[PDB]
Amino acid sequence: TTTGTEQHDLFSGTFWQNPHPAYAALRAEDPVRKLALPDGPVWLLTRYADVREAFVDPRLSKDWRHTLPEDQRADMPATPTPMMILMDPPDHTRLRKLVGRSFTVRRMNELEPRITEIADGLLAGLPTDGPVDLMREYAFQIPVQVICELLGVPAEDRDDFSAWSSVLVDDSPADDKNAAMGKLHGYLSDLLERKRTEPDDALLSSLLAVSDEDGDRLSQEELVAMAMLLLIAGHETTVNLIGNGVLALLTHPDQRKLLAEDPSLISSAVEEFLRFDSPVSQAPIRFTAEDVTYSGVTIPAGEMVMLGLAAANRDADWMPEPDRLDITRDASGGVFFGHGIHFCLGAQLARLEGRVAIGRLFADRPELALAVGLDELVYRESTLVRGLSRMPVTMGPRSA
Ligand code: HEM
Ligand SMILES: [Ca+2]
């Protein structure tokens, strides 16, 4: 709950339907908020400038060991599995540097024609007369197929791969979500050992070959962790980019008709969807190495911090009229992909998938409409994520 003039629900009740008035309430009246979450307390930065500068704040680290007393941490491993997103320099830098050599913005762009055939394929298999769940049938699909094309997952293994991927996004997130984790992990290892014998154009083959101006390469353990990471960070988030962006246009006809007339605005549109309804609403947990101070509030060392990306993006100090959806905007400096050394590695691929999935969906089905009321929509009860479990839509006649 909120503590200001008017008390909004936080991470319960109405929050999950629409967290934005609660974010507006926090930015205004309680910008650095200690939340009594079930697991442990966590501080929430909602103001733009706070979040923006917290990302590049050295006193904020990804090492969870900062919560344990100084002597007790000289014993514990830093991370369970070597994913760079869990690491600080110089350990993160070494992995980021290597991945970046092969996972280039160029490869990200060269998938564009391939992505289109996935969307068009999926669109071609959707009935003129709905109702159809646009999430499970379309938005759930594009990000996982694209990731296969990037990694080079054999066409045979792709049904099995997407099957396990759905568990992570929308399923029984308890023990059943972790069952698919070990299955996807195992498959990718065996895949890497197959890629060693038979190489290809794909990124997994590319990553195996990457040395540097020191002869440093990715170890087996690091390779498969990276493969697993690209999947987790690149699936659910991009799904919800699609989910949220489609929903944004459906609820704003004025803007849907702007895009209809000028389909080149899609690139500008996807930018403002990431702002207007940030799919990753909360940044992965950070830790205080020492007393930081934001908007008057001093977070003591050893505390868990959370950066309100969704909140910081609708901040009026940064963005004029921050609650109005304008796809023609010239936005610059949103915190939806993050900031600093942890900036979204697949930022450009995400944008591509976004523009293709959304742009082609509307061009192919100009009569698209929600097949249920706005309030009937169920949103996932996830802390980090802002997105739908189901989105019933009526497709309409295909345009030829
Ligand atoms: C679809 C919209 C997406 C959003 C809103 C998003 C958001 C983010 C954010 C905020 C971070 C920084 C996390 C932090 O600093 O704690 C991040 C990191 C990352 N993302 Fe994305 N992401 C998206 C799509 C993707 C895609 C498609 C990929 C595929 C490669 C991807 C891969 C990664 C990776 C590998 C990192 C770790 C960066 C590092 O630690 O150096 N993301 N993402
Ligand atoms: Ca098989």
Swiss-Prot record:
<dbReference type="Pfam" id="PF00067">
    <property type="entry name" value="p450"/>
</dbReference>
<keyword id="KW-0408">Iron</keyword>
<dbReference type="GO" id="GO:0047748">
    <property type="term" value="F:cholestanetetraol 26-dehydrogenase activity"/>
</dbReference>
<keyword id="KW-0560">Oxidoreductase</keyword>
<dbReference type="InterPro" id="IPR017972">
    <property type="entry name" value="Cyt_P450_CS"/>
</dbReference>
<dbReference type="GO" id="GO:0005506">
    <property type="term" value="F:iron ion binding"/>
</dbReference>
<dbReference type="InterPro" id="IPR036396">
    <property type="entry name" value="Cyt_P450_sf"/>
</dbReference>
<keyword id="KW-0479">Metal-binding</keyword>
<keyword id="KW-0963">Cytoplasm</keyword>
<protein>
    <recommendedName>
        <fullName>Vitamin D(3) 25-hydroxylase</fullName>
        <ecNumber>1.14.15.15</ecNumber>
    </recommendedName>
</protein>
<keyword id="KW-0349">Heme</keyword>
<keyword id="KW-0503">Monooxygenase</keyword>
<comment type="similarity">
    <text>Belongs to the cytochrome P450 family.</text>
</comment>
<comment type="function">
    <text>Hydroxylates vitamin D(3) into 25-hydroxyvitamin D(3) and 1-alpha,25-dihydroxyvitamin D(3), its physiologically active forms. Also displays 25-hydroxylase activity on vitamin D(2) and 7-dehydrocholesterol. May play a role in the biosynthesis of steroid metabolic intermediates.</text>
</comment>
<dbReference type="GO" id="GO:0005737">
    <property type="term" value="C:cytoplasm"/>
</dbReference>
<dbReference type="InterPro" id="IPR002397">
    <property type="entry name" value="Cyt_P450_B"/>
</dbReference>
<feature type="binding site" description="axial binding residue">
    <location>
        <position position="344"/>
    </location>
    <ligand>
        <name>heme</name>
    </ligand>
</feature>
<dbReference type="GO" id="GO:0020037">
    <property type="term" value="F:heme binding"/>
</dbReference>
<dbReference type="InterPro" id="IPR001128">
    <property type="entry name" value="Cyt_P450"/>
</dbReference>
